[PDB]
């Protein structure tokens, strides 16, 4: 099933994981008044790459999905699994967590790949 | 080619003052220092000062200071120089000469005078 | 195990020196100054409310102010930013007209100022306009009955009238570095701008820097720490200008003590020339005052900093400028919109051995301006209404030495400069640019899989 | 401990490996005179991506750290492990190796991923 | 052997796999009339990154080579292995497949990483 | 094919009176107009 770009917006978050290949696919799209379009298409890569950085500096860089050894503080919208993916869309969901997002990432970048990848060397040096 | 072309020779009474014109050509006028030098007959060379043609900065020796007035007409690309209070000792053949490189360079204006 | 391999490292603290295009910043409050683009700030990016600065420990970086490209990038900016402002304004090429000038109405005791009648054009292409204005003598030159005149530029350079809406007032500008580059702030107190720096910290943006355009005297600028620092790329070379930074500011009070009428003359459609009507009342000449005390106080604080470079016991003399254009021979600055030029002979008329009132400086105002000397193009600054007054912290100096003369007896010094790059160095001495090299390769006992 | 951006510059190289998540994080940062800023921010991605290429064409692309099967010629600053990481900062270190850097990379790109990844197929084809 | 950039063009496709580190290496290369060069170098990253996206949204992102669990429809130029790599250059080869390329990718992006990476979570959640 | 994708269970808050799209366009028509005016004939000699 292909509902098109951003079809699963009003879908519950679980139904929206089927569409990551759709939203991520068209995220890049391959004088005077010519300026108008030019500075525009630049923001697309400035925008796209800042995630690749985040995705990259974390245990991912491998797009779509990727897990992490960072736990979940219940101080960030303590909910049941079904109460989230099954009962919430992403918009409803992303609306809540936007408080601790920056607090979340400081772990994934520093607590994880800054720390976990070095342990890999400490294990791989022998 | 560049060309330093000076004024005609002049025959003057003592006590007076005298200017010399020296019109440049063939290079960026305002970018190059200009020295003035007299050479008394059979004698050595007396460095009389210099001008930077940008806004007209100058610097004379202690000997020649007071008597020397050195200028340039960026519009017309003419350097002027005036020794004043002329004495019989102030009889010489007076030159203008340009340093090797433009003012942007290091150690200009003290390198060496090329066009004469 | 014991043998060494290679292992890549992303994000190592490694930088190399390089130059790149920077960009500006001037707060968000100066953005509200508007008044139809005052001076510069327009697309100038706002400032970080917390200008975060990161000290760098065991970091020793070699700074140079005299070669710092940041001075040239800025220098070319002020120039180009200025032409953009000049472009939309009124071309005064119809003013290049023979001028019937009479000296100004005073009871003898002599003019500098001319009451010049002349024919002008109107918005109607055939009808013409018998008008008169006042001009300072430095803007006109006579041309050979009473004497006729003409603007001094008319024969060399085209002339345009600065838009009356734009202001020439300086605004603090923070220069900034993009990602992959960053700025280094040399923080040690007594620092001669050349050589390495003990305390090095990084900022992404310089502080607020007001592009003050002034000759001889520096105004409204940065002060030094502890002793007054004296920096010159080379002192043995007397030709190398010497830049001074104060620890203490010197107040100066400058006025145009003349209540000024401004007539707006219609040459249009859309083209309008702002002339000068009468001065209202007493005719006084512009001047600046300086506390003769604190002035002479600062002369001594300096002269004691000079013998550090010349003799334990020696003589030091001050003289006025030897010669040059008006911009160099006198002190150029824009006060209140008018452009002032003040005789500083009374400041540099002193002599110093090993061991209450105020001065006043006669000033001159010009309106037709060719600043940066670029022939072909001159700017006519419109007049400012009423009496002008402004006050500035004197914060630095540009000086030239003398020559061989007598060997070690005494040395003389005079004002000078006139290249605005040196005005920019006064603020960028502690700054320099670098590019990062985050990829690191080094040996270790690690090895990837098979 | 977070010393900020480039805090570990004068730190010995070993202490600086704690800060890779810091220097790599802000390496991207999300008319007339507008030109001034525009061409600037472009060099940031031109600069950033050329590493991603190098990092990518080698056995990495996974940011921060990553090992390699390329050995170490003692003709490149033959030193002891401690004499480098413990006694040298990165600046002191990077100052030396800048001679053979280009000679080093020609291995990582060609001797490694050009060669080692194909062996992977030769092993994975059955 | 280093034949330079694009040396293996007229080479059979198998000989050209030796040169991936060469063609991929220089694929990025680190007023008026200045415009001319500027918009040019931007297309380089717009061009380069659209592959990184494709390479990334598929099971790759790891450059040069990478395999996939997507089969091969014989309706796409049914040939023998040797008839392709050994007897064809890439130009001869790429000339044929250009019909179903878009049909091929819709699998790698959707059938694979959209589907296979989630199974990874379903396996890694316990 | 101006492809359009309906969004289900999607409820978005629209405003026309604050929509910046109006200002971006508004400034475009103006500036586009001066570019057209620039190469043409200045009638300042007609002020007669
Ligand atoms: C530079 O600059 C300058 C400056 O200027 C200024 O400034 C500027 C900036 C601006 O602001 C301006 O505006 C100013 O002005 C310039 O110079 C100048 O100046 C001056 C100043 O003041 C000015 O003058 C003014 O003017 C005005 C006008 O007047 C006129 O007009 C009117 C009308 O409006 C009239 O009324 C009058 O009169 C006048 O004139 C006239 O005209 C007519 C016509 O044209 C004529 O007729 C004729 O005639 C003949 C025969 O004769 C024939 O026929 C012919 O055709 C005809 O046409 C007549 O004549 C005439 N008149 C005469 C007289 O003559 C007015 O407003 C004013 O005035 C007023 O005030 C005053 C007071 O303040 C008065 O009185 C006066 O006073 C005095 C003293 O104080 C006097 O003086 C004297 O004189 C004698 C002789 O005479 C001697 O010298 C002595 O020593 C002296 O001291 C005078 O004179 C008187 N005046 C007369 C006029 O008279 C007056 O008046 C008035 O007032 C009123 O009056 C009445 C009677 O009349 C009474 O009753 C009442 O009360 C009263 N009121 C009050 C409130 O006060 C004045 O004057 C002028 O304009 C000017 N100019 C110009 C051009 O602009 C210059 O220019 C420059 N430069 C260059 C190069 O750029
Ligand atoms: C070294 O630094 C010092 C300090 O930084 C500088 O000293 C400055 O000197 C300049 C002149 O060179 C002075 O500028 C003029 O000052 C006028 C006084 O304004 C104050 O009073 C009025 C009335 O009480 C208030 O409205 C003003 O408030 C404004 O500013 C504050 C911030 O301080 C804002 O919060 C407000 O919103 C206002 O914007 C001040 O308190 C001032 O009139 C004048 O500005 C007029 O003139 C210019 C052209 O000359 C016009 O572009 C502008 O629009 C203004 O025109 C209005 O006013 C005039 C009357 O003045 C009328 O004719 C017009 O119709 C119109 O209404 C100008 O700013 C300045 O005060 C002084 N101080 C500072 C802090 O800058 C030195 O110059 C400097 N040296 C060098 C070499 O750079
Ligand atoms: C703006 O521009 C105007 C026009 O250029 C200038 O005014 C003219 O100036 C000239 C020069 O002086 C004047 O010429 C003089 O004209 C007299 C004859 O004029 C008669 O006819 C005119 C019409 O053509 C009438 O308006 C006038 O009333 C007269 O009936 C002569 O008398 C003059 O020559 C004699 O006098 C002078 C001294 O005044 C002597 O030097 C001469 O040798 C000679 O003996 C003279 O030629 C002219 O009349 C003016 N007006 C016009 C053309 O209307 C303005 O000065 C100028 N203003 C500026 C530049 O500020
Ligand atoms: C302006 O900037 C210049 C440099 O840019 C500085 O000038 C230096 O000044 C000193 C003193 O005048 C000079 O040093 C002397 O030079 C002698 C020979 O010079 C040769 O060798 C040097 C290498 O040292 C080369 O750079 C140079 O090109 C020449 O080939 C040496 O023999 C001297 O050493 C001995 O003499 C002096 C006293 O004579 C003693 O103090 C020393 O201890 C020692 O016994 C001496 O080094 C130097 O050459 C100049 N450098 C250059 C490059 O020209 C100015 O100092 C600077 N101005 C200020 C105010 O800082
Ligand atoms: C920058 O600043 C310097 C210094 O302030 C100025 O230099 C001055 O220049 C003027 C102009 O020449 C000099 O003024 C001269 O002063 C004499 C004073 O007259 C009376 O005053 C004293 C005592 O008060 C009495 O002893 C004296 O007898 C007088 O009663 C006048 O004598 C001079 O004018 C007369 O002489 C000259 C010939 O020399 C004649 O041509 C004149 O017509 C007139 O008869 C004269 O005015 C002043 O002395 C200078 N001072 C210094 C220190 O140099 C610069 O001018 C100034 N530059 C700029 C660009 O602003
Ligand atoms: C929008 O929400 C509705 C209601 O939750 C969803 O419709 C349900 O779909 C499931 C699965 O097919 C059915 O079992 C329910 O009976 C449906 N209920 C209703 C009221 O429609 C719908 O699928 C959602 N769609 C999106 C795109 O979010
Ligand atoms: C400025 O001061 C610095 C030190 O702060 C001086 O740098 C020295 O320069 C010489 C070369 O002439 C080096 O060999 C020395 O090692 C430097 N010293 C230090 C402590 O770094 C520099 O000479 C001074 N320059 C001026 C013009 O005063
Ligand atoms: C320049 O002017 C300033 C203010 O216009 C003067 O400072 C004031 O001086 C008066 C006396 O004239 C004192 O009563 C004030 O307290 C001072 N105010 C401030 C804020 O300093 C200054 O003295 C003048 N300087 C000169 C050299 O004339
Ligand atoms: C800068 O160098 C100094 C000296 O090597 C370091 O300070 C040492 O730190 C260690 C670890 O805490 C102590 O055991 C030593 O006693 C310290 N010695 C001295 C002389 O300070 C310092 O940590 C270094 N800092 C950076 C940022 O490089
Ligand atoms: C171009 O094609 C020719 C012919 O297929 C190739 O030359 C052959 O190379 C192999 C391997 O060295 C030899 O065994 C054959 O005898 C050669 N035959 C001929 C006719 O040359 C050549 O290598 C190809 N080169 C490229 C770059 O594609
Ligand atoms: C984990 O959460 C802790 C508790 O946060 C506090 O309590 C919750 C319920 C909210 O009210 C929140 O605003 C309070 O601050 C934090 O103290 C702790 O730092 C958190 N840890 C991380 C890594 O975020
Ligand atoms: C490994 O190093 C070999 C030796 O290099 C030579 O000797 C050293 C000590 C230096 O003086 C160096 O400049 C000399 O060239 C090289 O011959 C050999 O190519 C190197 N191998 C690689 C892969 O770099
Ligand atoms: C696999 O191929 C099937 C057959 O394609 C049809 O037959 C071949 C020989 C060609 O003539 C072709 O144009 C025809 O459409 C397709 O029906 C099927 O969709 C293909 N599957 C995929 C995933 O591409
Ligand atoms: C100048 O300053 C000195 C201090 O160095 C002071 O003793 C002297 O009185 C001052 N002289 C004048 C004329 O102001």
Alpha-carbon gap, residue C211 to C76, rounded angstroms: 12
- DSSP-assigned states of every residue in B38-87: EE-TTS-EEEEEEE-TTTT-EE--TTTTTT-EEEEETTTTEEEEEE-S--
C contacts of B56 (beta carbons < 8 Å): 323-325, 328
Q: Is the peptide bond before B109 cis (omega within 30 degrees of 0)?
A: yes
Q: Which of E48, A5, C329 is nearest to B69 (CA)?
A: C329
Q: Which of C157, C240, C207 is nearest to C24 (CA)?
A: C207
Helices within C287-419 (DSSP H only):
292-306, 326-329
Whether the Cβ atoms of residue B58 and residue B52 lie closer than 8 Å to each other: yes
Q: What share of chain C is helix, strand, coil (3-state, %, to 5)?
A: 10, 35, 50
Ligand 12: centre distance to CA D74 (Å): 8
Method used to solve the structure: X-ray
User: Is C291 near ligand 8, meaning CB less than 6 Å away?
Assistant: yes
A119 interfacial to chain C (CB closer than 8 Å): no
CB neighbour list of residue E26: distance below 8 Å, 6 or more residues apart: E5
Spell out the SS3 assignment of chain F.
Answer: CCCCCCCCCCCCCCCCCCCHHHHHHHHHHHHHHHHHHCCCCCCHHHCC
Residue E73 CA: nearest ligand 13 atom is 1
Touching partners of A (3+ C-beta pairs < 8 Å): C, D, E, F
CA nearest A56 in C: which residue?
C10
Q: Tally C-beta pairs within 8 A across A and E.
A: 48
Q: Nearest ligand to the C-alpha of residue A77?
A: 11
C contacts of A121 (beta carbons < 8 Å): 7, 444, 446
A contacts of E121 (beta carbons < 8 Å): 65, 67
Q: Is the peptide bond before A49 cis (omega within 30 degrees of 0)?
A: no
Whether the Cβ atoms of residue C442 and residue D84 lie closer than 8 Å to each other: yes
Q: Which of C418, C214, C254, C238 is nearest to C336 (CA)?
A: C254
Alpha-carbon gap, residue C83 to C22, rounded angstroms: 20
In angstroms, what is the resolution? 3.5
Alpha-carbon gap, residue C82 to C166, rounded angstroms: 11
Touching partners of E (3+ C-beta pairs < 8 Å): A, D
* Maximal C-alpha separation, chain A: 62
Query: In a 3-state reduction of DSSP, which class is residue E120?
Result: helix
Contacts made by residues F25-28, CB under 8 angstroms, sequence distance 24+: F28/A33, F28/A36
Ligand 7: centre distance to CA C194 (Å): 7
Chain centroid to CA C207:
17
CA angle A38, A41, A46 (to 5 degrees): 120
D contacts of C437 (beta carbons < 8 Å): 94
CA nearest A126 in C: which residue?
C1
Chain centroid to CA A117:
20
Alpha-carbon gap, residue C56 to D7, rounded angstroms: 6
Whether the Cβ atoms of residue C160 and residue D26 lie closer than 8 Å to each other: no
| Superfamily of the domain at B1-116 | Immunoglobulins (2.60.40.10)
Ligand 3: centre distance to CA C151 (Å): 24
Touching partners of B (3+ C-beta pairs < 8 Å): C
Query: In a 3-state reduction of DSSP, which class is residue C43?
Result: coil
CA nearest C269 in F: which residue?
F44
Q: How far is C267 from chain F (nearest CA, A)?
A: 11
C182 strand-pairing partners: C434
Q: How far is E37 from chain D (nearest CA, A)?
A: 12
Cross-chain Cβ contact A32/F31 below 8 Å: yes
User: Is F5 near ligand 6, meaning CB less than 6 Å away?
Assistant: no
Q: How far is E110 from chain D (nearest CA, A)?
A: 23
- Residue nearest ligand 11's atom 12 by CA: A75
E contacts of A40 (beta carbons < 8 Å): none
Query: In a 3-state reduction of DSSP, which class is residue A27?
Result: helix
Cross-chain Cβ contact A124/C1 below 8 Å: no
Alpha-carbon gap, residue A64 to A24, rounded angstroms: 8
E38 interfacial to chain D (CB closer than 8 Å): yes
Ligand 1: centre distance to CA A52 (Å): 82
Ligand 1 mutation pick, C114, C132, C265, max ligand atoms within 8 A of CB? C132
Ligand 12 mutation pick, D70, D71, D72, D73, max ligand atoms within 8 A of CB? D73
Whether the Cβ atoms of residue C317 and residue C410 lie closer than 8 Å to each other: yes
Q: How far is F44 from chain A (nearest CA, A)?
A: 26
C contacts of F48 (beta carbons < 8 Å): 124-126
CB neighbour list of residue E105: distance below 8 Å, 6 or more residues apart: E54, E58
Q: How far is F43 from chain C (nearest CA, A)?
A: 10
Q: Do chain D and chain A touch with ≥3 beta carbon pairs under 8 Å?
A: yes
The torsion angle over the Cα atoms of residues A80, A86, A88 and A90, rounded to 10 degrees, is: 110
Alpha-carbon gap, residue C193 to C185, rounded angstroms: 11
E103 interfacial to chain D (CB closer than 8 Å): no
Tell me, what DSSP letter sits at residue C421? H
- DSSP-assigned states of every residue in C193-237: SEEEESSEEEESB---B-----SSEEES-PPPSSSPPEE-S-SSS
C contacts of A125 (beta carbons < 8 Å): 444-446
CB neighbour list of residue C301: distance below 8 Å, 6 or more residues apart: C228, C248
Q: Which of C428, C421, C439 is nearest to C186 (CA)?
A: C428
Alpha-carbon gap, residue C393 to C396, rounded angstroms: 9
Alpha-carbon gap, residue B5 to A118, rounded angstroms: 75
Ligand 11: centre distance to CA A17 (Å): 29
Question: Which helix H or strand E contains A18, and what residues bound it?
Answer: none
Ligand 5: centre distance to CA C257 (Å): 24
Cross-chain Cβ contact D13/C12 below 8 Å: yes
D contacts of A61 (beta carbons < 8 Å): 61-63
Beta strand extents in C105-172 (DSSP E only): 113-121, 128-136, 140-142, 148-151, 158-161
User: Is C296 near ligand 14, meaning CB less than 6 Å away?
Assistant: yes
Distances from the Cα of C282 to the Cα of A32, C50, C257, C279, C387, angstroms:
54, 50, 9, 8, 11
A37 interfacial to chain F (CB closer than 8 Å): no
User: Is C117 near ligand 3, meaning CB less than 6 Å away?
Assistant: yes
Phi, psi of C301 (to 5 degrees): -55, -35
Q: Which residues line ligand 13 (CB under 6 A)?
A: E 73, 75, 103
């Amino acid at each position: 099933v292909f509902l098109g770009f951003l079809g699963a917006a009003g879908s519950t978050m679980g139904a929206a994981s089927m569409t990551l290949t759709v939203q991520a696919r068209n995220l890049l799209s391959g004088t005077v008044w010519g300026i108008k379009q030019l500075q525009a298409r630049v923001l697309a890569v400035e925008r796209y790459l800042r995630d690749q950085q985040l995705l990259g500096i974390w245990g991912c860089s491998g797009k779509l999905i990727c897990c992490t050894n960072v736990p979940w503080n219940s101080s960030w919208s303590n909910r049941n699994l079904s109460e989230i993916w099954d009962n919430m869309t992403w918009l409803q969901w992303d609306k809540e967590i936007s408080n601790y997002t920056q607090i979340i990432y400081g772990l994934l970048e520093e607590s994880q790949n800054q720390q976990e990848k070095n342990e890999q060397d400490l294990l791989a040096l022998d | 080619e560049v060309q330093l072309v000076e004024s005609g020779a002049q025959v003057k009474k003592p006590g007076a003052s005298v200017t010399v014109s020296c019109t440049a050509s063939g290079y960026k006028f305002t970018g190059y220092h200009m020295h003035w030098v007299r050479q008394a007959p059979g004698r050595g060379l007396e460095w009389m000062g210099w001008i930077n043609p940008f806004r007209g900065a100058v610097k004379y020796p202690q000997n020649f200071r007071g008597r020397v007035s050195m200028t340039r007409d960026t519009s017309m690309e003419i350097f002027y120089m005036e020794l004043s209070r002329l004495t019989s000792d102030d009889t010489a053949v007076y030159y203008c000469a340009r340093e090797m490189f433009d003012s942007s360079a290091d150690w200009s204006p003290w390198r060496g005078m090329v066009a004469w | 195990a014991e043998n060494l391999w290679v292992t890549v490292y992303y994000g190592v603290p490694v930088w190399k020196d390089a130059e790149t295009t920077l960009f500006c910043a001037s707060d968000a409050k100066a953005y509200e100054t508007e008044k139809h683009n005052v001076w510069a700030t327009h697309a100038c990016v706002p400032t970080d409310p917390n200008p975060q600065e990161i000290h760098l420990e065991n970091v020793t970086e070699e700074f140079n102010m005299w070669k710092n490209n940041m001075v040239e990038q800025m220098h070319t900016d002020i120039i180009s930013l200025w032409d953009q402002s000049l472009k939309p304004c009124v071309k005064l090429t119809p003013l290049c007209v023979t001028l019937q000038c009479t000296n100004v109405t005073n009871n003898i005791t002599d003019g500098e100022l001319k009451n010049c009648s002349f024919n002008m054009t109107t918005e109607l292409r055939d009808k013409k306009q018998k008008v008169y204005s006042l001009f300072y003598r430095l803007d006109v030159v006579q041309i050979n009955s009473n004497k006729e005149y003409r603007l001094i530029n008319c024969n060399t350079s085209a002339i345009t009238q600065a838009c009356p809406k734009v202001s020439f007032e300086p605004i603090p500008i923070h220069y900034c570095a993009p990602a992959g580059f960053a700025i280094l702030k040399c923080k040690d107190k007594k620092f001669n701008g050349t050589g390495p720096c003990p305390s090095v910290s990084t900022v992404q943006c310089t502080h607020g820097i007001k592009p003050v355009v002034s000759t001889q005297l520096l105004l409204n600028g940065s002060l030094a720490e502890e002793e007054v620092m004296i920096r010159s790329e080379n002192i043995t070379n007397n030709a190398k200008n010497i830049l001074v930074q104060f620890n203490t500011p010197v107040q100066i009070n400058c006025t145009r003590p003349n209540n000024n009428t401004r007539k707006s003359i219609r040459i249009g459609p859309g083209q309008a020339f702002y002339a000068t009507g009468d001065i209202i009342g007493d005719i006084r000449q512009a001047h600046c005052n300086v506390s003769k005390a604190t002035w002479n106080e600062t002369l001594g604080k300096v002269v004691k900093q000079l013998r550090k470079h010349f003799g334990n016991n020696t003589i030091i003399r001050f003289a006025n400028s030897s010669g040059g254009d008006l911009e160099v021979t006198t002190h150029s600055f824009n006060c209140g919109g008018e452009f002032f030029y003040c005789n500083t002979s009374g400041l540099f008329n002193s002599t110093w051995i090993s061991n209450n009132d105020s001065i006043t400086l006669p000033c001159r105002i010009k309106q037709i301006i060719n600043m940066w000397q670029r022939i072909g193009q001159a700017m006519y600054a419109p007049p400012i209404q009423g009496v002008i007054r402004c006050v500035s912290n004197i914060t630095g100096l540009i000086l030239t030495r003398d020559g061989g003369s007598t060997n070690s007896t005494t040395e003389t010094f005079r004002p000078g400069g006139g290249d605005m790059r040196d005005n920019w160095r006064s603020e960028l001495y502690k700054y320099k640019v670098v590019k990062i090299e985050p990829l690191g390769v080094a040996p270790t006992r690690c090895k990837r899989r098979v």
